[PDB]
Amino acid sequence: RRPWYIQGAASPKDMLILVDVSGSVSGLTLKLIRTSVSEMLETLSDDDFVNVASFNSNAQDVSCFQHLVQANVRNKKVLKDAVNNITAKGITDYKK
């Protein structure tokens, strides 16, 4: 998980984290998903671009970004704060 190892282990990325917030993910799996998404954001550097989306019968953005962002400390902080604020409700729709 060190930045030097991560930069030497692969090329930069255009990552999109898709999060299921349908009704069935309510409970333990929702907190686990939040922690997992924060840890996954912790693996990204300034040369990667990330955005976190969320779908439950309708797909939207978790924050005020609406597109890929540089994923520096500030943008990752915003994405983490937005991810720690989601709730589970609705019906799953993988297509949208």
Binding site: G23, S24, S26, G27, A88, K89, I91
Partner: protein
């Protein structure tokens, strides 16, 4: 007087089976089978 009771007993058995296979989902979620059982319960209701 016809064996109308046997078919009704089989119908109620099928209704109980449909009730058993229903999967309760949290926070207003559903799957294909649950949606398919919400339509089958119309068949039981009209027969009753």
């Amino acid at each position: 007087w016809k064996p109308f009771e046997t078919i009704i007993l089989l119908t109620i058995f099928a209704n109980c089976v449909a009730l058993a296979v229903y999967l309760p989902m949290p926070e207003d979620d559903n799957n294909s089978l649950n949606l398919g059982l919400e339509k089958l319960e119309y068949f039981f209701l009209t027969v009753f």
